[PDB]
Design a protein around this nucleic acid. Structure first.
Ligand SMILES: [Zn+2]
Ligand SMILES: [Zn+2]
Length: 55
RNA sequence: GGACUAGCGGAGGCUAGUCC
């Protein structure tokens, strides 16, 4: 238990850290970062991918 | 508060509902 919100995993939540699917940044082993899982630039995000569209 | 169901999210919170 502890953190029922974790149930979000029931929707193959996406890791906002690495940008994978199956775990969240919270449950992400990687350190708290902000590397666009699109271009690989640390600072911006996919939503604001200054490289290319967001799928 | 908890747990679910939902739902979205670059941030995981929020609410509702039911239960006490
Ligand atoms: Zn991750
Ligand atoms: Zn980018």
């Amino acid at each position: 238990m502890q953190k029922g919100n974790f149930r979000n995993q029931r929707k193959t939540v996406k890791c906002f850290n690495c940008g994978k699917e199956g775990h969240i940044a919270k449950n992400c082993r990687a350190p708290r970062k902000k590397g666009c899982w699109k271009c690989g630039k640390e600072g911006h995000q996919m939503k604001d991918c200054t490289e290319r569209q967001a799928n």
